[PDB]
Design an enzyme around this catalytic site. Structure first.
Site, short mmCIF file in Angstrom:
data_model
loop_
_atom_site.label_atom_id
_atom_site.label_comp_id
_atom_site.label_asym_id
_atom_site.label_seq_id
_atom_site.Cartn_x
_atom_site.Cartn_y
_atom_site.Cartn_z
N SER A 44 0.80 -1.23 0.00
CA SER A 44 0.00 0.00 0.00
C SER A 44 0.83 1.27 0.00
O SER A 44 0.25 2.35 -0.12
CB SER A 44 -0.98 0.03 1.16
OG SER A 44 -2.10 -0.78 0.86
N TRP A 79 -11.27 -3.67 3.02
CA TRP A 79 -10.40 -2.70 3.70
C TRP A 79 -10.56 -1.31 3.09
O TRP A 79 -9.60 -0.63 2.71
CB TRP A 79 -8.92 -3.13 3.76
CG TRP A 79 -8.64 -4.62 3.62
CD1 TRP A 79 -7.79 -5.22 2.74
CD2 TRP A 79 -9.26 -5.70 4.34
NE1 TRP A 79 -7.78 -6.59 2.91
CE2 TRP A 79 -8.71 -6.92 3.86
CE3 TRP A 79 -10.25 -5.77 5.32
CZ2 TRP A 79 -9.10 -8.16 4.32
CZ3 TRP A 79 -10.63 -7.01 5.77
CH2 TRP A 79 -10.05 -8.19 5.27
N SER A 104 -5.37 4.02 4.15
CA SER A 104 -5.00 3.01 3.17
C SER A 104 -6.25 2.46 2.46
O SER A 104 -6.27 1.31 2.02
CB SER A 104 -4.18 1.91 3.81
OG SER A 104 -3.28 1.43 2.83
N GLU A 142 -4.67 -6.63 -6.00
CA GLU A 142 -3.99 -7.56 -6.88
C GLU A 142 -2.49 -7.30 -7.00
O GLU A 142 -1.83 -7.97 -7.79
CB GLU A 142 -4.67 -7.59 -8.25
CG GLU A 142 -6.11 -8.09 -8.14
CD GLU A 142 -6.79 -8.27 -9.48
OE1 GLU A 142 -6.20 -7.97 -10.55
OE2 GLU A 142 -7.94 -8.74 -9.46
N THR A 209 2.47 3.76 5.02
CA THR A 209 2.80 2.37 5.25
C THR A 209 2.32 1.44 4.13
O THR A 209 1.39 1.75 3.38
CB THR A 209 2.14 1.91 6.56
OG1 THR A 209 0.73 2.16 6.49
CG2 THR A 209 2.70 2.63 7.76
N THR A 211 1.77 -3.13 3.88
CA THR A 211 1.93 -4.43 4.52
C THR A 211 1.37 -5.51 3.58
O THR A 211 0.21 -5.90 3.70
CB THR A 211 1.23 -4.49 5.88
OG1 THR A 211 1.66 -3.42 6.70
CG2 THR A 211 1.55 -5.79 6.59
#
Length: 264
Positions: A44, A79, A104, A142, A209, A211
Site C-alpha cells: 500500500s 479494507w 489506506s 492484486e 505504510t 503491509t
C-alpha cells in the site's frame, strides 16, 4: 567491512529476511544506505505516490480535487473503511486522496487510479519526476503477492526516498499541492508503530505504510521534521524468503532508529 551497515545486517538476520533503508538529511546531504537500491514490494505504500500524482493532475484540471465522485457498491473492495460510508453521497477527489493515504482505503485508491489512467498512469507520473525504478501494474487488491524475484509492483528504498523528497520538499508539485501532500502524510493513522515509533514525540512526521504481509513484506516511508533541523526523508522496506514469514513493525522502527543514528 562496512561498519555502518553491520547493525542493519544483524537486524535483518534476526528478522529472517532482508531490510532496505535509505535516509537523506536534506540539510547536510548526509545519507545512510543499506540495500538501498534493491527492489522491495510497494504494497500500500504506492498510495502516497498515487495521491501526489492526483495532486499534479489537479494543477491543470480546474476543480479536479473538489469534484465529487459518486460510486456504487461495485467500487467497494475489502479494507475500505472510509469509502464504505459514502455510497449514496460520494466523496470528493481530495477526500478520496486523504482516505487512501491516511487509512489506506482500497476502494478510494482504485477510484483515484481511474483518474490517472490506471497503474500505468501512476507509473508514467513517477517517470515524469525522474523515478526510473517505481513499477506498478495492478489495482487493489492484486498488487500484493510479493513473490521473491518478481520485480512487478516494486521500487527501491532509494528511489522511494528520492521521489518523496521531490514531491514533499522539492519542486515536483506546485507549492499548494506540495503542501496538501505533506498535510495528508502528516495525518496518516496507520504508521504509529513504524518510523513514528523511532522519533521523539515532538518531531513532526508524515508517512505512508504498506503491509503485503506474505513473505515478511512490509514498509514505511516518511518525511521527518526534527526540532531545529532541516527535514529527513527516509524509507524502510522489508521482505523474507518464505510465504508464511511474518513482517515486523518493530524491525521497521529499529531500522529507522539506526538510520537516524547514522546521520550526522
Amino acid at each position: 567491512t562496512n561498519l555502518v551497515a553491520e547493525p542493519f545486517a544483524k537486524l535483518e538476520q534476526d528478522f529472517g529476511g532482508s531490510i532496505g533503508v535509505y535516509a537523506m538529511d536534506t540539510g547536510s546531504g548526509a545519507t545512510v544506505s543499506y540495500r538501498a537500491e534493491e527492489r522491495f514490494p510497494l504494497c500500500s505504500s504506492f498510495k502516497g505516490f498515487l495521491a501526489a500524482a492526483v495532486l499534479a493532475r489537479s494543477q491543470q484540471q480546474a476543480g479536479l480535487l473538489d469534484t465529487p465522485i459518486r460510486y456504487g457498491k461495485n467500487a467497494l473492495v475489502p479494507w475500505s473503511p472510509i469509502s464504505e460510508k459514502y455510497l449514496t453521497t460520494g466523496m470528493t477527489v481530495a477526500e478520496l486522496s486523504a482516505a487512501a493515504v491516511q487509512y489506506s482505503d482500497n476502494a478510494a485508491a482504485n477510484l483515484l487510479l481511474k483518474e490517472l489512467g490506471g497503474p500505468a498512469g501512476l507509473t508514467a507520473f513517477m517517470r515524469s519526476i525522474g523515478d526510473t525504478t517505481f513499477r506498478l501494474d495492478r489495482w487493489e487488491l492484486e498488487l500484493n503477492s510479493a513473490i521473491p524475484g518478481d520485480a512487478r509492483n516494486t521500487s527501491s528504498p532509494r528511489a522511494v526516498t528520492e521521489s518523496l523528497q521531490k514531491l514533499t520538499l522539492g519542486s515536483a508539485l506546485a507549492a499548494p499541492q506540495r503542501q496538501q501532500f505533506v498535510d495528508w502524510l502528516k495525518g496518516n493513522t496507520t504508521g504509529n508503530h513504524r518510523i513514528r515509533a523511532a522519533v521523539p514525540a515532538d518531531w513532526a512526521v508524515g508517512d505512508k505504510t504498506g503491509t503485503c504481509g506474505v513473505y515478511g513484506t512490509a514498509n514505511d516511508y516518511a518525511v521527518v521534521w526534527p526540532t531545529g533541523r532541516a527535514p529527513i526523508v527516509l524509507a524502510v522496506y522489508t521482505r523474507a524468503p518464505n510465504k508464511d514469514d511474518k513482517h515486523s513493525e518493530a524491525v521497521i522502527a529499529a531500522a529507522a532508529r539506526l538510520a537516524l543514528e547514522g546521520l550526522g
